């Protein structure tokens, strides 16, 4: 029994804090605003059973925005191979990845 | 412990007796550890030695039930050459019931556990054959 009093009376008791893509103070975006907007607009109205299978791409992009697991795994792989090549001596870091280039602006 | 039941049921009946006996022994040992865990939980033993004695007693009791069950079921499937037959698990469940009576040192508990555990193991074999579901997935 989800008695939907908020939709029945037209009052917004708690829909405003429910998602990150809702109206925020000073129009501050969430970091995953575009991914959450894509996943919500994909999965809207088609029901949860169809949304599990038909919006999997947007939901996987949004979960990977939220937790950055694939990104951190890729950075792990790059940094580990870099440390292995530094230990083997088969690589040297450039001057712009050592701190000798006096950044852009 | 769902993979314990899977490595029990993956082997055909009457083919590899030692590994079926070991798998049923491990299922019985896991059930005995669960019973021992709640037993020393809800009823505090008087010492640590009494607690590990109760744990070892219940674990070895249920593991011996499982061992003699799997052994008797696989031997009855071998000597009758009928692997898909619930009478084999009826004999195995009665052997496990006689084991549970031998651990409790009483004949009446042995005969009662023979009858009820043999009928239960027969029903489990029939459910594996005809595909009976206890935790059935919602379909409609």
């Amino acid at each position: 029994p989800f008695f939907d009093v908020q939709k029945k009376l037209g009052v917004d008791l708690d829909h405003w804090m429910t998602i990150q893509s809702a109206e925020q103070p000073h129009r501050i975006p969430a970091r995953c605003h575009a991914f959450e907007k894509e996943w919500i607009e994909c999965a809207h109205g088609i029901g949860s059973i169809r949304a599990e299978k038909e919006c999997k791409i947007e939901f996987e992009d949004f979960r990977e925005c939220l937790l950055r697991q694939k990104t951190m795994k890729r950075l792990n792989a790059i940094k580990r191979q870099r440390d292995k090549l530094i230990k083997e001596g088969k690589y040297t870091p450039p001057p712009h990845h050592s701190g000798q280039e006096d950044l852009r602006p | 412990a769902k993979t314990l039941l899977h490595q029990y049921w993956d082997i055909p009946e009457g083919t590899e007796c030692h590994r079926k006996t070991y798998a049923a022994t491990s299922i019985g040992g896991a059930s005995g550890l669960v019973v021992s865990a709640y037993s020393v939980a809800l009823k505090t033993p008087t010492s640590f030695l009494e607690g590990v004695a109760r744990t070892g007693r219940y674990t070895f009791t249920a593991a011996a039930i499982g061992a003699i069950f799997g052994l008797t079921s696989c031997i009855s499937a071998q000597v009758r050459e009928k692997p898909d037959d619930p009478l084999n698990y009826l004999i195995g469940g009665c052997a496990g019931g006689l084991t549970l009576g031998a651990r409790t040192r009483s004949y009446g508990i042995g005969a009662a556990a023979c009858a009820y555990m043999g009928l239960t193991a027969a029903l489990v074999k029939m459910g594996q054959l005809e595909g009976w579901k206890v935790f059935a997935e919602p379909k409609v």
């Binding site: 008695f3 939907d4 009093v5 939709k7 029945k8 029901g47 | -």
Partner: protein, 120 residues
């Protein structure tokens, strides 16, 4: 099951499409049974307070009957509405999915072979 059906317009006891349906008659035997339950509640109310059961508080017995008939009429309206919604959804789903509901070829018993089992 049908909870997404009544979720676009929530908390409606009887929606506007329920008025397309014929209402229960006032001589509905279900409604007469609910009135009988009100009469039984009035008798138990006299019995537990040690009033004379058939005679005392006829106004109270009549308000029991009236209140049960009043609530039960709307409960029967909602019941008939929900079974009508059930059948409307069933028929619209069968009409929209013909590949899932084919017309089965009905065979007469001259072609149908059934095994005979003698009782002897």
């Amino acid at each position: 099951m049908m909870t997404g059906r009544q979720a676009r317009a929530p908390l409606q006891f009887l929606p506007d499409e329920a008025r397309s349906l014929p209402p229960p008659k006032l001589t509905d035997p279900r409604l007469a049974y609910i009135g009988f339950l009100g009469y039984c509640s009035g008798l138990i109310d006299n019995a537990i307070r040690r009033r004379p059961v058939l005679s005392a508080g006829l106004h109270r017995q009549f308000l029991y009957i009236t209140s049960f008939v009043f609530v039960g009429y709307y409960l029967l309206k909602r019941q008939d509405y929900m079974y009508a919604v059930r059948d409307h959804d069933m028929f619209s789903y069968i009409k929209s999915h013909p590949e899932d509901f084919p017309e089965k070829d009905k065979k007469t018993y001259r072609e149908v072979f059934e095994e005979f089992h003698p009782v002897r």
